[PDB]
Amino acid sequence: FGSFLVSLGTSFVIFVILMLLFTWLSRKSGNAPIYYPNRILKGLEPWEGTSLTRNPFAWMREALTSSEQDVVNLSGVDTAVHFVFLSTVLGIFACSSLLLLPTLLPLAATDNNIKNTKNATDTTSKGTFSQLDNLSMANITKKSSRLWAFLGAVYWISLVTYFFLWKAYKHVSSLRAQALMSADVKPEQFAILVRDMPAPPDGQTQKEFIDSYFREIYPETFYRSLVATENSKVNKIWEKLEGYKKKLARAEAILAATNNRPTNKTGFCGLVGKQVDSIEYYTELINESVAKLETEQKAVLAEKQQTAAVVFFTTRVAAASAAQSLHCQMVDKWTVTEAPEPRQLLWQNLNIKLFSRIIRQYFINFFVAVTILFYMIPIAFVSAITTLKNLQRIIPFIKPVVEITAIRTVLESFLPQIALIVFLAMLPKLLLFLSKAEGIPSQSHAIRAASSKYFIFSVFNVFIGVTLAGTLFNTVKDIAKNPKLDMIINLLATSLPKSATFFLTYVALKFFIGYGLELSRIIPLIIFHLKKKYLCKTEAEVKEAWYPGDLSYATRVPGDMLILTITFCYSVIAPLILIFGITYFGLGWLVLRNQALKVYVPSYESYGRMWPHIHQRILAALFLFQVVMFGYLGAKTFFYTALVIPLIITSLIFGYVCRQKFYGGFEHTALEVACRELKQSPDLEEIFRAYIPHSLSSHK
Amino acid sequence: FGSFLVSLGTSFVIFVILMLLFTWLSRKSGNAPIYYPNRILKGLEPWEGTSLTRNPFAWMREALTSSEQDVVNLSGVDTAVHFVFLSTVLGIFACSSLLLLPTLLPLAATDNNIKNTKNATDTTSKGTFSQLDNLSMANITKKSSRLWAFLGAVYWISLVTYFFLWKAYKHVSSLRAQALMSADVKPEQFAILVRDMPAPPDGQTQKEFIDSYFREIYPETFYRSLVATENSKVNKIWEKLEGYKKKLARAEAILAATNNRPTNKTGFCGLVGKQVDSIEYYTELINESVAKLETEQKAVLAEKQQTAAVVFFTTRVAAASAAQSLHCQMVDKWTVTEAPEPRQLLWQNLNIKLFSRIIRQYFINFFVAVTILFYMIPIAFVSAITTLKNLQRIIPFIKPVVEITAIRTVLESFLPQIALIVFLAMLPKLLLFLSKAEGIPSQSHAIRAASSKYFIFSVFNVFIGVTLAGTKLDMIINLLATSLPKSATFFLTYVALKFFIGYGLELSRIIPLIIFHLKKKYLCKTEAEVKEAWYPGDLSYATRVPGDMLILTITFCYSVIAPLILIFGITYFGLGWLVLRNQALKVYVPSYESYGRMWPHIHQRILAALFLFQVVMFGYLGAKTFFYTALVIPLIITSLIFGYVCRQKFYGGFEHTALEVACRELKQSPDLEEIFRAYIPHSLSSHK
C-alpha cells in the first residue's frame, strides 16, 4: 500500500528535476550555477560546459568528478567533513548490503505469518500483511536456526561500522591538520576570550584592570586588550542607521522625480501625508542618527564596560598556548577559552558568569524535555478550535458553494496538519534561540547544541509517538506503578514490523521531496523572481536578494542522522530499509556535492569541529541499535546474552578509546602548526579591525 | 557481637594507653615525641611530653592547641587536607547527632518487633541480644507518621553534608592557594613530562630529536631535555653497590680483630668458609662493582634511550603553561603532563604508549574485579587442606592433646582465619602493585588509584557479606554458601577492631617499638644503621583514607535506619582526629608534597557515599509504605547535580598549579644545574 506514496514521491522527483533542467539553461543565479561563482571571480560559473549548448548531464558529471581537496579549496573545511560523513555512512550501509543477501534467504524459507500463527489474524486485529511483511522481520519461529538473521549479522554490521567510523575519524583529523597548517593569517591565532573577570576594580576602571592583570602574567607579549560593552543601544541605533541609508539609496534610485514614500507601508507610523520630499527626510534622520550614535559610542567606551574581554598576544604560539592554561588558583575567575571567529562570537550572549551558565543549561534542557513531553497538548486545543468551518463570515462571497462540497473533505483534516507544520517550521529557529541563552560563545557551538537538541527531539518524536501511543496524558498517572523493562522489550518486539513499513514509507517521502526541492531550489527561485517583480529594483538590493546562506548544518545533519538511526535500528529486522538508506545517502551525496560546489556559501570556519559530535551520535545510534537487537533476540528465544552483550561493552569501549585517541585533537589547535611557518610579518591594528563590533566601529 | 567487641576494644585500648603513658617516660625515639622532632634541628625536641615533669595529658593538650597553619609550617599540606577531611566528617556527624535526639523517641513509641510481627519470633532471625535491637530498623508500623525515620532526617543529613562538603572544599582550595603561593625554588614548577615521543629518530639519536623538536616550538625558553632510560640493569648495579658500601660501613666496627662474616649468612650462598677478612673481600668487590656501574651507566645513558623524556624551561610561567597545552595536532603523540616531584615519579612504569596504558587499565580493572568476586574461592580449598588436623605427623607432640579439648578447637577455626590474615596483609601491597601497572606516573596517582581500589573492594566485600543474613554445576556454585559466612564474620570482627584497637596500636606504636628494640639488640651496632633503623615512614594515605571512608560509608548507610550507630561513627572520628594530630604532628613525616591534591579524590567519594545512602533509603522506604518519592527523588537528583556543580567550579584549581600564583616573585635567579641534580636517577649520579 505504501507503493502509492512511493510513486507519488517518484513523480514529484521527476517533475522537479525536469523543472531544474528546463530552468538551468536560463540566465539565472538563484539556481544551477549560482551566487558562489558569481562572487568568486566567475570561477564555477556556467562556462562552456554549462554555457550555451549545455549538457543535461553536465551537473552530474561535474559533481561526480570533483575531489575533496577541490571542495575544501572552494568552500570551507566543514563542508568537506560533512561529505566525509556521507561517504563513510554510505560505505557502512553498502557493506551491510553486501552481507544482506544471505539474510534474505530465511525470509522466504521460514513462513511464520504464512503458517498457523495467523489464527484469522486473531479475529480481532490486523497488522503485518503486505506481501513483504512476510519477507520482513524474517518471520522466524520462536526457536528456529535464525543464525543469519541474528548475532552473526549484528556482529558484521558492528564490525564494519567500527572500522569505517575509525577510518573516517582519522581522515577527518588529517583534513583538520592539513587545512589548519596551510592557512593564512586569520585573526584567531592572535586572540583568546576571558569572560569571568572579577567585577570590581576597587577604585579603578575595568580595562586598566585587565591590562594590569595580564601584564603581570605575560610581559613583552601583547598588542592590547579589548573589553566587552553593553552594546545593545548602539546596535539598535546602528540598524536604524543602516536601514535609513538603505532606504535613502532606495529613494535615490528613482532618478526621475522626487520620491515620496508614505508611512502606511511600514505600519509603525501614521505620517502618510508627510511622505513629501522623503528623499531628504532621511538625511536629518541620519544626522540625528549619526549624532546619537557618536554620543552613545563615546559614552559607552568609558562608562559601564562589562566583566568580559578578549586579549591579543603577539605570537601565534603564545595565543594558542595561553588559551588552555589556568589563570587563577581558583577556577571561577578569569575563565579562558580560545577566541572564536570575528563573524562567529556572540557579544550579546557573552559576559555570563559561570553559575548563570550552569543554571541556564539545566533550565533550558528541562524546558526542552517538558516541551517534548507536552508537545501535542496545545495542538489538540488548536485543532479543537472552531476554525474548522467558518463559512458564516464570508464577506467576499466569490465562490462559496464550490469549495464546501468537493474539497472540504480534506481541508478539515488539513487544518490540524497546518497547526502541526507551523510548529515544525518554527522549531529549528526556536531551538537555535534556546541554545543561544545557554551562554554558548562561538556561535558554531550554538549550532552544534541545536543539532543535538533537534536530534533528540526527532528521535523521541518518531520512534515513540509513531510506534506506540504518544499522548499518555491520562496514562502518566498509572505509569507510576508500571512494570519493569520486560513489558517494554515485549512491546518493541511486537510493534517493530508495522513501524518498519511506516518508516520505509517515511524515508521514501523525505528522500523524494527533500532532495527534489533542495536540488531544484524552486522555492528560493520563486521568492527571487517575485521580489524582483516586487521591491527588488536597484542593483544593491537585488544583489542582496540572492544570498544563498550557509549549509544550515544546524538542521541538515539532524535529519540525515535521524534517517541513519532509522537505517540501523531496523537494519536486520527489515533488510528492505538498507537499500532505501543507501539510496538516500547516495542521492544526498550527489545533490549536496552539486549544491555545496555551486550554490552554497559558508559563514563559519569551524575547521572540521563538527565531526566529533557526528561520530559520537553515530556511535550512540549503533549502541541503540545493538540494545534493540539484544532485546528482540531476547524475545525470539535464542542465545541472546553471550552473543550481543560483549559487543555492547565493545561499543562503549570503542567510544572511550576513540575519544581518548583523537577528541583532544579537535578542542585545541596545536603548537606545531601554531609555530610552523610564519613568513609575512603579522599586523597589529588590522586585528582589532576584525573583532571590533560592527555597530561600535566609527571611533577614534 | 556488640558486648564482646565493646569489651575487647575498651580493655585493649586501656592497656595500650597505659603502656604509652608507662613507656613515654623513657628516652625512646620511635615512640611518644619521636624521630619527627628528632631530625628537624630538634625543633620539637622531646618536650614536656617527655621532658622534666611530664603530664599524661601533655600530648592531648599539645594536639588540641595546635593550628592548621602550624601543621602546614611543620608538615606537608597533605597532612592538613587529611585533617580537614577528618574535621569535615566529624562536623557532619555532629550536626546529624544534634538532630538525632528527636529521632530516637518514636523508636521507643512504636514496638513493631515486640508486637504481632513476632509471630513466634518469626523462627528465622536471632542473635546477640542487648535490648538495643528494640531500636534497630526503627521498628515503626508500616504506615504511621514515620517522618522521623524519613524525609526529615534524610533531608537534614543531605543539607548538612552539602554545606560541610562545600565549605571544606573551598577551605582546601584556599589552603592550596596560600601554600602554593609562598613557596621556594622547588624543581616541580620548572618541568613537564612528555612521554609519548614517537618512535623514529629517523637517522639520528632520540635526544637530538627531542631537542630539535622543542627548539622549534620554544625558542629561547629551554635548558635541555633529560630523556628516559632503561634503568633496570643500572639500577640493579647501583643498589648492589650501595649494599656493598653499607657492608663496608659494617667493618669500621672492627674494635676486636678482623671481621669475618660468611657469604652463606646473606642466604644466596652455601660456603661459610669464605669469612676471611670481609674488610678486604668487599673492597675489590666494590671496585669491580664501581667498574661495572661505570660501564653500564656510560652505555645506557648513550645507547638506545627509550621513548620518553622530561623538559626544563627557564621560567615558571612557560613551564606551568606548557604542561596544560597540546603540542601535536593529534594527541597520540607528544603527550604532555605536569612534571611530578623528583622523589614521586616512577621511571620504571614511565614510557608506556597510550594504547598500552588504555589496555592495561582495562585488564587490571577487570582482574581486580575478578578478585573482588572470587575472594572466597581459593580460601575454601585452603581451609580444606590437611591443615585442619595435622596431629598425625606432629613429631614433637609435647602437649597438644591437653589443648585440643580446651582451646585448640578454636585454633582450628583461626587456621582459616590465618589464611584470611595472610591475604588481608598482602592485599594493600598487591593493590598498590597492580595500580603501579596501569602506567600511572606520579606515584601520588598510584596511591590515589590504590585507595579507590581498596575502598571498592571493602564495600563490595563487606556489604555482599551482610546483604541479608548472609550466614555437576552444583558442586562449584554451592561452595559459596559454605565459604561466605566466615568472610562477613571476620570482616565485622576486623571493623570492630578498627573502632578502638587500630587507633590504640597506631598511637602507642608497640609494634614499631618492639621492631626498633629488636633491631637495636641485633647486629645493628653502627650509628648510621640505628639512625636509619627508625625511619618513621610516610603517612600511608594508601590504607588510612579508604579505611576511614569505609567507616564513613558504614556510618551513613545505616545512619537513620539505626540512629544508634551515628554516635559510634562520631566517637570514632573524634578520637581519630586526636590520634592523627598527635601522630602526624610528632612522628610521621610525608614522602610526598602533593600540595593537597588528595582532597578531590575524597570529596568525589563522600558524595558517592551520600548518593548510595539516598538510594538505600529510597529502597527501605519502598517496603515501608510511605511517600517513597518525596524524601529521595528530588534529592538524589540534587546530589547528582551537586557533583557537577562542585566539579565545574573548583576542580581545575587542583589539577594544575597556576599562572597568576606561579609567576609572581622568584627572588634570585633560579639555578639550572641545580635542577638536574634532582631529576637525575640515583643510579646515574656520577657522570660527566
From Swiss-Prot, chain B:
Residue ranges that the UniProt entry lists as topological domain Cytoplasmic: 24-83, 169-356, 438-446, 516-540, 581-598, 649-688
Record's keyword annotation contains tRNA processing: no
Extracellular topology ranges: 107-145, 384-409, 561, 623-627
Regions that span the bilayer: 3-23, 84-106, 146-168, 357-383, 410-437, 447-470, 484-515, 541-560, 562-580, 599-622, 628-648
Principal location listed in the UniProt entry: membrane
Membrane-topology descriptor: Multi-pass membrane protein
Any one GO MF annotation of this record: mRNA binding
Pfam families: PHM7_cyt, RSN1_7TM, RSN1_TM
GO cellular component, one term: plant-type vacuole
Subcellular location: Membrane
Annotated phenotype, changing R605E: Induces a closed conformation
Keywords in alphabetical order: Calcium, Coiled coil, Ion channel, Ion transport, Membrane, Transmembrane, Transmembrane helix, Transport
Domain of life, source organism: Eukaryota
Coiled-coil segments: 239-307
Record has Calcium as a keyword: yes
Family stated for the protein in its record: Belongs to the CSC1 (TC 1.A.17) family.
Quaternary state and interactors: Homodimer.
Free-text function comment from the UniProt entry: Acts as a hyperosmolarity-gated non-selective cation channel that permeates Ca(2+) ions. Mechanosensitive ion channel that converts mechanical stimuli into a flow of ions: activated in response to membrane stretch. Not activated in response to membrane poke.
Name the UniProt record assigns to this protein: Hyperosmolality-gated Ca2+ permeable channel 3.1
Native species: Arabidopsis thaliana
Lineage start: Eukaryota, Viridiplantae, Streptophyta, Embryophyta, Tracheophyta
This protein's encoding gene: OSCA3.1
